[PDB]
């Protein structure tokens, strides 16, 4: 079993030298799920994390104006996959969050360029936050709330590719699912409205160009909002017509879980 371990150790060492870092990132990214202890191995040295963070820092000049290549995007995404590995491990998650590592990813979420290198960079960056929200931790929710991730997700939900829209909606859904999260969004009409308006624009687009995967997350967000009494009275007035119609009835005939959620939403809204 030591042949795998010795290969992992060698690649970890190779991240220190910039001459061997690119190949080491590629090899280690392929083992992000195969090796369960990969995250504490990576976190052990400040040097390994500094090297991964250096890869993120190297593409910040490719933002203004947008000049990112597929090669640049692909290499940084290999380093984001190693950070995602550290974000989701039970031994390293708290330390990753105490080190404010997601903040290094926020400049990538702020980008608006629709070229594939930037859109796929946002997809992978969203994936790191996605892995982090999936852990189902109060510390994660508190971090995301104070660092203003909600506006970043809403922008992507409105203008991103189908996959980026799904991850962004999934992040919002997981924040909404938490009691602190739902209370935060429903605290002011402004915050609720930002969410409701974007969800509404998404329903109108899904009625033109369908996506059952995206619709599943959009409906779950609306259903969670219905649990708050103020959001429920607001939705009685602003809920899109397409959700009360037979608009998605054809598609939802094959998606029982979503059809159930939409039924529970109309039931919550009819008092």
């Amino acid at each position: 079993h030591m042949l795998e371990r010795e290969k992992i150790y060698q690649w970890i060492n190779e991240l220190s030298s910039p001459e061997t870092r690119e190949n080491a990132l590629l090899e280690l990214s392929k083992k992000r799920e195969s090796v369960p202890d990969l995250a504490p191995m990576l976190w052990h040295s400040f040097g390994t994390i500094a090297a991964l963070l250096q890869e993120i820092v190297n593409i910040y000049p490719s933002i203004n104006p947008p000049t990112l290549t597929a090669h640049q995007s692909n290499r940084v995404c290999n380093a984001l996959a190693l950070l995602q590995c550290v974000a989701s491990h039970p031994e390293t998650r708290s330390a990753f969050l105490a080190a404010h590592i997601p903040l290094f990813l926020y400049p990538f979420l702020h980008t608006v360029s629709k070229t594939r290198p930037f859109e796929y960079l946002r997809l992978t960056s969203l994936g790191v936050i996605g892995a982090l929200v999936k852990t189902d931790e109060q510390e994660v929710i508190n971090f995301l709330l104070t660092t203003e991730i909600i506006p970043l997700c809403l922008r992507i939900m409105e203008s991103g590719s189908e996959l980026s829209k799904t991850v962004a909606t999934f992040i919002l859904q997981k924040i909404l699912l938490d009691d602190t999260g739902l209370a935060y969004i429903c605290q002011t009409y402004e915050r609720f409205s930002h969410v409701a308006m974007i969800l509404g624009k998404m329903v109108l687009q899904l009625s033109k160009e369908p996506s059952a995967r995206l619709l599943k997350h959009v409906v779950r967000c609306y259903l969670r909002l219905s649990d708050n009494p103020r959001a429920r009275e607001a939705l009685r007035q602003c809920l899109p017509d397409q959700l009360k119609d037979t608009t998605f009835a054809q598609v939802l005939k094959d998606d029982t879980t979503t059809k159930r959620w939409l039924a529970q939403l109309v039931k919550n809204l009819q008092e």
Partner: peptide, 25 residues
Amino acid sequence: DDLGFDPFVETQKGLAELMENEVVQ
């Protein structure tokens, strides 16, 4: 199965086509 896809795997697929053609040999 909550997401239904792997964001990193989808990135590698999406960029593979562009990486093979973006640099003029």
